[PDB]
Amino acid sequence: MAPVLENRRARHDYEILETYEAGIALKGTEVKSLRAGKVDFTGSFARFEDGELYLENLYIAPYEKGSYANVDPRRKRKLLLHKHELRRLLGKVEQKGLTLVPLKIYFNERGYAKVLLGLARGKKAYEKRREDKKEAVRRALEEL
């Protein structure tokens, strides 16, 4: 029921080489909050641990109908890919120096949520500032 979400800083931070419509296996209740918009990806990507992907460190609120049936909210959820795609990205992590970041969590005609993963390079826009006068002149005094 939720619209397309946004990984705001990752869309505006990492260069998206290509995408995948991945999948998430929700571990039992973390559904309606993601169906109402409670998701914040800041400090999260999708990390493998030697066989499979987990969407790491994603904070979703435990739903308030479960008065005591809450879940640890920022966890590593079992992401879903294909198997050749999965071992492909498992290779590509060590081939190219990537980081695998989500872009959105959008729903399909089966009424399911799919986390749109995407590749990174870094998109290094960070300006290493040119040297001010009071360091260039003491480097020049060293050069004297």
The rounded distance, in Å, linking the Cα atoms of 130 and 28 is: 52
* Position among 49, 50, 67, 128 found at the interface with RNA (CB under 7 A): 128
Among 83, 84, 110, 128, binds Mg ion (CB under 5 A): 128
How many residues touch Mg ion under the rule CB under 5 A: the total is 3
Return d(Cα 36, Cα 92) in angstroms, integer.
34
* Helix segments in 4-132, DSSP class H: 8-11, 32-36, 83-95
List the single partner that 70 binds among Mg ion, RNA, none, CB under 5 to 8 Å by kind.
Answer: none
Q: How far apart are CA 25 and CA 46, in angstroms?
A: 13
Helix (H, G, I), strand (E, B) or coil at 65: coil
Task: Tell me which residues in 64-103 interact with RNA (CB under 7 A).
Answer: 65, 78, 80-86, 88, 91, 94-97
The contact set with RNA (CB under 7 A) reads: 1, 8-9, 12-13, 18-23, 25, 32, 35, 51-52, 65, 78, 80-86, 88, 91, 94-97, 108-112, 114, 121, 124-129, 134
